[PDB]
Symmetry: C2
Subunit: 210 residues, 2 copies
Protein backbone atom coordinates (compact mmCIF):
# COMPACT_ATOMS: atom_id res chain seq x y z
CA UNK A 1 0.00 0.00 0.00
CA UNK A 2 1.40 3.37 -1.09
CA UNK A 3 -0.65 6.36 0.03
CA UNK A 4 -0.83 9.37 -2.27
CA UNK A 5 2.12 11.77 -2.54
CA UNK A 6 2.29 15.14 -4.28
CA UNK A 7 5.22 16.91 -5.92
CA UNK A 8 4.88 20.22 -7.79
CA UNK A 9 7.35 21.32 -10.46
CA UNK A 10 7.14 25.10 -10.12
CA UNK A 11 8.84 28.42 -10.82
CA UNK A 12 8.38 31.16 -8.23
CA UNK A 13 7.04 33.78 -10.64
CA UNK A 14 5.03 31.54 -12.97
CA UNK A 15 1.38 32.58 -12.87
CA UNK A 16 0.33 29.12 -14.09
CA UNK A 17 2.27 27.45 -11.27
CA UNK A 18 0.94 29.97 -8.77
CA UNK A 19 -2.66 29.01 -9.60
CA UNK A 20 -1.89 25.42 -8.66
CA UNK A 21 0.00 26.47 -5.50
CA UNK A 22 -3.19 28.31 -4.51
CA UNK A 23 -5.37 25.25 -5.04
CA UNK A 24 -2.95 23.14 -2.99
CA UNK A 25 -2.74 25.69 -0.19
CA UNK A 26 -6.50 26.33 -0.02
CA UNK A 27 -7.05 22.55 0.21
CA UNK A 28 -4.48 22.20 3.01
CA UNK A 29 -2.40 19.83 0.92
CA UNK A 30 1.32 19.40 1.55
CA UNK A 31 3.57 18.88 -1.45
CA UNK A 32 7.24 18.67 -2.39
CA UNK A 33 8.37 21.82 -4.17
CA UNK A 34 10.64 21.15 -7.14
CA UNK A 35 12.14 24.29 -8.67
CA UNK A 36 12.57 24.63 -12.42
CA UNK A 37 15.20 27.00 -13.86
CA UNK A 38 12.68 28.73 -16.12
CA UNK A 39 14.94 31.58 -17.17
CA UNK A 40 17.53 29.14 -18.50
CA UNK A 41 14.79 27.07 -20.10
CA UNK A 42 13.29 30.10 -21.83
CA UNK A 43 16.69 31.16 -23.17
CA UNK A 44 17.17 27.72 -24.69
CA UNK A 45 13.60 27.65 -26.04
CA UNK A 46 14.16 31.08 -27.58
CA UNK A 47 17.21 29.91 -29.53
CA UNK A 48 15.49 26.71 -30.67
CA UNK A 49 12.11 27.68 -32.14
CA UNK A 50 6.87 23.26 -18.68
CA UNK A 51 5.46 24.25 -15.30
CA UNK A 52 3.28 23.48 -13.53
CA UNK A 53 3.53 19.71 -13.49
CA UNK A 54 1.86 17.99 -10.56
CA UNK A 55 3.49 14.61 -10.01
CA UNK A 56 1.19 12.28 -8.10
CA UNK A 57 2.22 8.82 -6.87
CA UNK A 58 -0.29 6.36 -5.48
CA UNK A 59 -0.31 2.55 -5.18
CA UNK A 60 3.06 2.34 -6.92
CA UNK A 61 1.89 4.24 -10.00
CA UNK A 62 3.02 7.72 -11.08
CA UNK A 63 0.90 10.36 -12.81
CA UNK A 64 2.14 13.60 -14.31
CA UNK A 65 -0.75 16.07 -14.37
CA UNK A 66 -0.43 19.14 -16.60
CA UNK A 67 -2.53 22.23 -17.47
CA UNK A 68 -3.49 24.41 -14.52
CA UNK A 69 -7.25 24.03 -15.03
CA UNK A 70 -7.06 20.24 -15.41
CA UNK A 71 -4.85 20.03 -12.30
CA UNK A 72 -7.23 22.23 -10.29
CA UNK A 73 -10.29 20.27 -11.40
CA UNK A 74 -8.47 17.10 -10.31
CA UNK A 75 -7.67 18.59 -6.90
CA UNK A 76 -11.35 19.54 -6.52
CA UNK A 77 -12.50 16.01 -7.41
CA UNK A 78 -9.81 14.10 -5.48
CA UNK A 79 -9.93 16.24 -2.35
CA UNK A 80 -13.44 17.80 -2.16
CA UNK A 81 -13.17 19.82 1.05
CA UNK A 82 -12.76 22.66 1.33
CA UNK A 83 -14.59 23.16 -1.95
CA UNK A 84 -13.21 25.49 -4.61
CA UNK A 85 -16.30 25.09 -6.81
CA UNK A 86 -19.83 25.89 -5.60
CA UNK A 87 -22.37 23.09 -5.31
CA UNK A 88 -24.89 24.37 -7.87
CA UNK A 89 -24.67 23.96 -11.66
CA UNK A 90 -25.08 27.66 -12.46
CA UNK A 91 -22.42 28.79 -9.99
CA UNK A 92 -20.00 26.15 -11.26
CA UNK A 93 -20.40 27.38 -14.83
CA UNK A 94 -19.88 30.97 -13.68
CA UNK A 95 -16.73 30.15 -11.73
CA UNK A 96 -15.31 28.10 -14.59
CA UNK A 97 -16.04 30.95 -17.00
CA UNK A 98 -14.23 33.46 -14.75
CA UNK A 99 -11.26 31.11 -14.55
CA UNK A 100 -11.22 30.60 -18.33
CA UNK A 101 -11.37 34.39 -18.91
CA UNK A 102 -7.85 34.34 -17.49
CA UNK A 103 -6.69 30.85 -18.50
CA UNK A 104 -7.59 31.17 -22.17
CA UNK A 105 -8.57 34.81 -22.59
CA UNK A 106 -5.80 36.82 -20.94
CA UNK A 107 -2.65 34.93 -19.94
CA UNK A 108 -1.84 33.31 -23.33
CA UNK A 109 -1.46 36.72 -24.93
CA UNK A 110 1.33 37.54 -22.44
CA UNK A 111 3.03 34.13 -22.74
CA UNK A 112 6.84 34.45 -22.65
CA UNK A 113 7.13 32.81 -26.07
CA UNK A 114 4.39 35.04 -27.53
CA UNK A 115 6.10 38.18 -26.23
CA UNK A 116 9.47 36.91 -27.43
CA UNK A 117 8.18 36.34 -30.97
CA UNK A 118 6.70 39.84 -31.00
CA UNK A 119 9.91 41.38 -29.65
CA UNK A 120 12.12 39.62 -32.21
CA UNK A 121 9.86 40.85 -34.99
CA UNK A 122 9.40 44.42 -33.72
CA UNK A 123 11.30 45.51 -30.56
CA UNK A 124 9.07 47.02 -27.86
CA UNK A 125 5.89 45.73 -29.49
CA UNK A 126 5.78 43.07 -26.76
CA UNK A 127 5.11 45.61 -24.01
CA UNK A 128 2.36 47.44 -25.92
CA UNK A 129 0.77 44.10 -26.80
CA UNK A 130 0.85 42.67 -23.27
CA UNK A 131 -0.58 45.87 -21.81
CA UNK A 132 -3.36 45.95 -24.40
CA UNK A 133 -4.39 42.33 -23.92
CA UNK A 134 -4.06 42.24 -20.15
CA UNK A 135 -6.12 45.44 -19.80
CA UNK A 136 -8.71 44.05 -22.23
CA UNK A 137 -8.94 40.83 -20.25
CA UNK A 138 -9.21 42.60 -16.92
CA UNK A 139 -11.89 45.01 -18.18
CA UNK A 140 -14.06 42.09 -19.25
CA UNK A 141 -13.26 40.19 -16.04
CA UNK A 142 -14.22 43.20 -13.89
CA UNK A 143 -17.69 43.28 -15.45
CA UNK A 144 -18.18 39.53 -15.08
CA UNK A 145 -16.85 39.34 -11.53
CA UNK A 146 -18.93 42.31 -10.38
CA UNK A 147 -22.09 40.41 -11.36
CA UNK A 148 -21.90 37.76 -8.64
CA UNK A 149 -18.98 38.70 -6.40
CA UNK A 150 -19.43 38.80 -2.67
CA UNK A 151 -16.30 39.07 -0.56
CA UNK A 152 -14.59 36.98 -3.26
CA UNK A 153 -15.03 36.49 -7.03
CA UNK A 154 -18.01 34.23 -6.46
CA UNK A 155 -19.92 34.79 -3.24
CA UNK A 156 -18.25 34.78 0.16
CA UNK A 157 -15.68 31.98 -0.11
CA UNK A 158 -12.60 31.53 -2.31
CA UNK A 159 -13.08 29.51 -5.51
CA UNK A 160 -11.07 28.52 -8.57
CA UNK A 161 -11.93 31.96 -9.96
CA UNK A 162 -9.77 33.66 -7.31
CA UNK A 163 -6.92 31.27 -8.03
CA UNK A 164 -6.81 32.70 -11.56
CA UNK A 165 -7.52 36.33 -10.66
CA UNK A 166 -4.77 36.88 -8.10
CA UNK A 167 -1.76 35.88 -10.23
CA UNK A 168 -3.15 37.75 -13.24
CA UNK A 169 -3.33 40.99 -11.24
CA UNK A 170 0.29 40.51 -10.15
CA UNK A 171 1.29 40.20 -13.81
CA UNK A 172 -0.71 43.33 -14.64
CA UNK A 173 1.29 45.26 -12.04
CA UNK A 174 4.52 43.90 -13.52
CA UNK A 175 3.51 45.47 -16.85
CA UNK A 176 2.74 48.78 -15.15
CA UNK A 177 -1.02 48.69 -15.70
CA UNK A 178 -3.28 51.03 -13.75
CA UNK A 179 -5.65 48.82 -11.77
CA UNK A 180 -7.95 51.65 -10.75
CA UNK A 181 -10.51 50.71 -13.46
CA UNK A 182 -11.06 47.29 -11.84
CA UNK A 183 -12.40 48.11 -8.37
CA UNK A 184 -14.17 44.76 -7.85
CA UNK A 185 -11.04 42.86 -8.85
CA UNK A 186 -8.93 44.97 -6.48
CA UNK A 187 -11.34 44.45 -3.57
CA UNK A 188 -11.37 40.68 -4.13
CA UNK A 189 -7.56 40.66 -4.48
CA UNK A 190 -7.29 42.42 -1.11
CA UNK A 191 -9.64 39.93 0.56
CA UNK A 192 -7.57 37.03 -0.79
CA UNK A 193 -4.26 38.59 0.24
CA UNK A 194 -5.27 38.53 3.91
CA UNK A 195 -5.65 34.74 3.83
CA UNK A 196 -2.83 32.47 4.96
CA UNK A 197 -3.06 30.12 1.92
CA UNK A 198 -2.72 33.05 -0.48
CA UNK A 199 0.30 34.34 1.47
CA UNK A 200 1.89 30.87 1.34
CA UNK A 201 1.43 30.55 -2.43
CA UNK A 202 2.81 33.98 -3.35
CA UNK A 203 5.98 34.08 -5.50
CA UNK A 204 8.05 35.72 -2.74
CA UNK A 205 7.45 32.79 -0.35
CA UNK A 206 8.67 30.08 -2.74
CA UNK A 207 12.00 28.26 -2.26
CA UNK A 208 13.35 29.50 -5.61
CA UNK A 209 12.46 33.16 -5.03
CA UNK A 210 15.77 35.02 -5.41
Amino acid sequence: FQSMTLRLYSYWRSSSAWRVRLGLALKGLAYEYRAVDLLAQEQFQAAHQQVPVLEVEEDGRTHLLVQSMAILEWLEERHPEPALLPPDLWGRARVRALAEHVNSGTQPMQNALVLRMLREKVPGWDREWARFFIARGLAALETAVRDGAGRFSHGDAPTLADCYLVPQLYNARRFGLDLEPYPTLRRVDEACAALAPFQAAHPDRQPDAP
Copy 2:
Protein backbone atom coordinates in the same frame (compact mmCIF):
# COMPACT_ATOMS: atom_id res chain seq x y z
CA UNK B 1 -33.75 23.23 -9.21
CA UNK B 2 -31.05 22.96 -11.84
CA UNK B 3 -32.21 19.62 -13.22
CA UNK B 4 -35.67 20.77 -14.29
CA UNK B 5 -36.57 20.57 -17.98
CA UNK B 6 -35.00 23.31 -20.12
CA UNK B 7 -34.82 24.69 -23.65
CA UNK B 8 -31.52 25.58 -25.36
CA UNK B 9 -30.43 28.29 -27.80
CA UNK B 10 -26.87 28.53 -29.11
CA UNK B 11 -25.40 31.81 -30.32
CA UNK B 12 -23.04 30.52 -33.00
CA UNK B 13 -21.06 31.59 -36.06
CA UNK B 14 -20.64 28.84 -38.66
CA UNK B 15 -16.85 29.04 -38.69
CA UNK B 16 -16.18 29.78 -35.00
CA UNK B 17 -14.02 26.99 -33.56
CA UNK B 18 -15.15 27.82 -30.04
CA UNK B 19 -18.81 27.54 -31.07
CA UNK B 20 -18.07 24.34 -32.96
CA UNK B 21 -16.81 22.73 -29.71
CA UNK B 22 -20.17 23.45 -28.12
CA UNK B 23 -22.08 22.20 -31.18
CA UNK B 24 -20.14 18.95 -30.81
CA UNK B 25 -21.01 18.63 -27.12
CA UNK B 26 -24.69 19.21 -27.91
CA UNK B 27 -24.70 16.76 -30.84
CA UNK B 28 -22.85 14.03 -28.92
CA UNK B 29 -25.38 14.32 -26.08
CA UNK B 30 -28.32 14.24 -28.48
CA UNK B 31 -29.59 17.62 -27.32
CA UNK B 32 -31.81 19.69 -29.57
CA UNK B 33 -31.19 23.42 -29.68
CA UNK B 34 -32.15 26.58 -31.56
CA UNK B 35 -29.41 28.06 -33.72
CA UNK B 36 -29.02 31.83 -33.39
CA UNK B 37 -26.54 33.05 -35.98
CA UNK B 38 -24.08 35.75 -35.03
CA UNK B 39 -22.38 37.16 -38.12
CA UNK B 40 -18.89 37.77 -36.76
CA UNK B 41 -17.65 38.93 -40.16
CA UNK B 42 -20.37 41.54 -40.77
CA UNK B 43 -19.86 42.64 -37.18
CA UNK B 44 -16.15 43.01 -37.91
CA UNK B 45 -15.96 44.54 -41.40
CA UNK B 46 -18.06 47.42 -40.08
CA UNK B 47 -20.05 37.05 -27.91
CA UNK B 48 -19.69 33.57 -29.42
CA UNK B 49 -20.47 30.94 -28.23
CA UNK B 50 -23.21 31.69 -25.73
CA UNK B 51 -25.51 28.87 -24.66
CA UNK B 52 -28.80 30.41 -23.55
CA UNK B 53 -30.68 28.11 -21.19
CA UNK B 54 -34.38 28.83 -20.74
CA UNK B 55 -36.76 27.34 -18.18
CA UNK B 56 -36.00 32.60 -16.57
CA UNK B 57 -32.73 32.77 -18.53
CA UNK B 58 -29.13 31.73 -17.94
CA UNK B 59 -26.44 32.76 -20.39
CA UNK B 60 -23.51 30.36 -20.30
CA UNK B 61 -20.18 31.52 -21.72
CA UNK B 62 -16.68 30.07 -22.37
CA UNK B 63 -16.57 26.79 -24.28
CA UNK B 64 -15.04 24.73 -21.47
CA UNK B 65 -17.46 26.05 -18.85
CA UNK B 66 -20.39 25.35 -21.19
CA UNK B 67 -19.18 21.82 -21.94
CA UNK B 68 -18.59 21.08 -18.24
CA UNK B 69 -22.16 22.26 -17.58
CA UNK B 70 -23.52 19.99 -20.32
CA UNK B 71 -21.60 17.10 -18.77
CA UNK B 72 -23.00 17.78 -15.27
CA UNK B 73 -26.56 18.45 -16.40
CA UNK B 74 -26.74 15.62 -18.95
CA UNK B 75 -24.27 12.97 -17.77
CA UNK B 76 -25.10 10.31 -20.41
CA UNK B 77 -23.50 9.69 -22.78
CA UNK B 78 -20.42 10.78 -20.88
CA UNK B 79 -17.81 13.01 -22.50
CA UNK B 80 -15.60 12.69 -19.41
CA UNK B 81 -14.67 9.27 -18.03
CA UNK B 82 -15.56 8.27 -14.46
CA UNK B 83 -11.99 7.74 -13.27
CA UNK B 84 -10.16 10.80 -11.97
CA UNK B 85 -6.91 10.22 -13.86
CA UNK B 86 -8.75 9.93 -17.17
CA UNK B 87 -10.70 13.10 -16.40
CA UNK B 88 -7.45 14.99 -15.81
CA UNK B 89 -5.96 13.64 -19.05
CA UNK B 90 -9.03 14.60 -21.08
CA UNK B 91 -9.18 18.06 -19.57
CA UNK B 92 -5.48 18.54 -20.27
CA UNK B 93 -5.93 17.60 -23.94
CA UNK B 94 -8.83 20.05 -24.14
CA UNK B 95 -6.84 22.82 -22.47
CA UNK B 96 -3.86 22.34 -24.79
CA UNK B 97 -6.25 23.64 -27.44
CA UNK B 98 -8.46 25.93 -25.34
CA UNK B 99 -5.64 27.87 -23.73
CA UNK B 100 -2.50 26.65 -25.49
CA UNK B 101 -3.31 26.88 -29.20
CA UNK B 102 -6.53 28.66 -30.19
CA UNK B 103 -5.86 31.97 -28.38
CA UNK B 104 -2.73 32.49 -30.50
CA UNK B 105 -4.84 32.37 -33.64
CA UNK B 106 -8.00 34.19 -32.61
CA UNK B 107 -9.41 36.90 -34.87
CA UNK B 108 -8.29 39.99 -32.93
CA UNK B 109 -4.78 38.59 -32.46
CA UNK B 110 -4.39 37.85 -36.16
CA UNK B 111 -5.75 41.28 -37.11
CA UNK B 112 -3.33 43.17 -34.89
CA UNK B 113 -0.44 41.09 -36.24
CA UNK B 114 -1.15 41.81 -39.91
CA UNK B 115 -1.92 45.45 -39.09
CA UNK B 116 1.64 45.92 -37.84
CA UNK B 117 3.25 43.43 -40.25
CA UNK B 118 1.46 42.36 -43.46
CA UNK B 119 1.28 38.61 -44.11
CA UNK B 120 2.73 37.70 -40.73
CA UNK B 121 -0.54 36.64 -39.07
CA UNK B 122 -0.66 33.44 -41.12
CA UNK B 123 2.98 32.51 -40.45
CA UNK B 124 2.32 33.13 -36.74
CA UNK B 125 -0.83 31.02 -36.80
CA UNK B 126 1.03 28.16 -38.48
CA UNK B 127 3.82 28.39 -35.92
CA UNK B 128 1.59 28.29 -32.85
CA UNK B 129 -0.87 25.76 -34.23
CA UNK B 130 1.99 23.40 -35.20
CA UNK B 131 3.47 23.85 -31.73
CA UNK B 132 0.12 22.96 -30.18
CA UNK B 133 -0.55 19.97 -32.44
CA UNK B 134 2.92 18.51 -31.83
CA UNK B 135 2.22 18.48 -28.09
CA UNK B 136 -1.22 16.98 -28.68
CA UNK B 137 0.10 14.28 -31.00
CA UNK B 138 2.43 13.08 -28.24
CA UNK B 139 -0.04 13.50 -25.37
CA UNK B 140 -2.79 11.80 -27.38
CA UNK B 141 -0.53 8.95 -28.55
CA UNK B 142 -0.25 7.78 -24.92
CA UNK B 143 -3.85 6.85 -24.14
CA UNK B 144 -5.68 7.15 -27.42
CA UNK B 145 -7.60 4.21 -28.78
CA UNK B 146 -9.65 5.08 -31.84
CA UNK B 147 -10.22 8.54 -30.33
CA UNK B 148 -8.25 11.08 -28.26
CA UNK B 149 -8.99 9.16 -25.06
CA UNK B 150 -9.89 5.51 -25.35
CA UNK B 151 -12.38 4.16 -27.83
CA UNK B 152 -15.22 6.69 -27.64
CA UNK B 153 -15.54 10.46 -28.16
CA UNK B 154 -14.74 12.74 -25.23
CA UNK B 155 -14.35 16.45 -24.60
CA UNK B 156 -10.82 16.11 -26.00
CA UNK B 157 -12.17 15.34 -29.48
CA UNK B 158 -14.51 18.33 -29.23
CA UNK B 159 -11.38 20.53 -29.07
CA UNK B 160 -9.15 18.56 -31.46
CA UNK B 161 -11.49 18.46 -34.45
CA UNK B 162 -12.11 22.20 -34.87
CA UNK B 163 -8.41 22.93 -34.29
CA UNK B 164 -7.38 20.59 -37.13
CA UNK B 165 -9.86 22.36 -39.41
CA UNK B 166 -8.15 25.66 -38.53
CA UNK B 167 -4.73 24.09 -39.17
CA UNK B 168 -5.88 23.19 -42.68
CA UNK B 169 -7.36 26.68 -43.20
CA UNK B 170 -3.90 28.14 -42.52
CA UNK B 171 -2.19 25.68 -44.86
CA UNK B 172 -0.36 23.82 -42.11
CA UNK B 173 0.94 20.43 -43.20
CA UNK B 174 -0.64 17.72 -41.03
CA UNK B 175 1.70 14.87 -42.01
CA UNK B 176 3.70 15.14 -38.73
CA UNK B 177 0.54 14.35 -36.71
CA UNK B 178 -0.52 10.85 -37.81
CA UNK B 179 -2.34 9.96 -34.58
CA UNK B 180 -4.35 13.20 -34.71
CA UNK B 181 -5.22 12.55 -38.38
CA UNK B 182 -6.51 9.06 -37.56
CA UNK B 183 -8.62 10.41 -34.69
CA UNK B 184 -9.97 13.17 -36.95
CA UNK B 185 -10.94 10.49 -39.50
CA UNK B 186 -12.69 8.40 -36.85
CA UNK B 187 -14.65 11.41 -35.66
CA UNK B 188 -15.60 12.56 -39.15
CA UNK B 189 -17.45 9.31 -39.87
CA UNK B 190 -19.83 9.93 -36.95
CA UNK B 191 -23.21 11.60 -37.44
CA UNK B 192 -22.85 14.05 -34.50
CA UNK B 193 -19.55 15.35 -35.92
CA UNK B 194 -21.07 15.69 -39.39
CA UNK B 195 -23.99 17.64 -37.88
CA UNK B 196 -21.72 20.10 -36.05
CA UNK B 197 -19.35 20.88 -38.94
CA UNK B 198 -19.26 24.50 -40.18
CA UNK B 199 -20.53 23.48 -43.62
CA UNK B 200 -23.82 22.19 -42.21
CA UNK B 201 -24.65 25.28 -40.14
CA UNK B 202 -27.58 27.57 -41.08
CA UNK B 203 -25.30 30.57 -41.67
CA UNK B 204 -22.65 28.78 -43.75
CA UNK B 205 -21.90 30.53 -47.05
CA UNK B 206 -21.20 28.55 -50.23
CA UNK B 207 -17.50 27.74 -50.84
CA UNK B 208 -17.15 30.60 -53.35
CA UNK B 209 -18.15 33.22 -50.77
CA UNK B 210 -15.73 32.14 -48.03
CA UNK B 211 -12.54 33.93 -47.01
CA UNK B 212 -9.32 32.06 -46.32
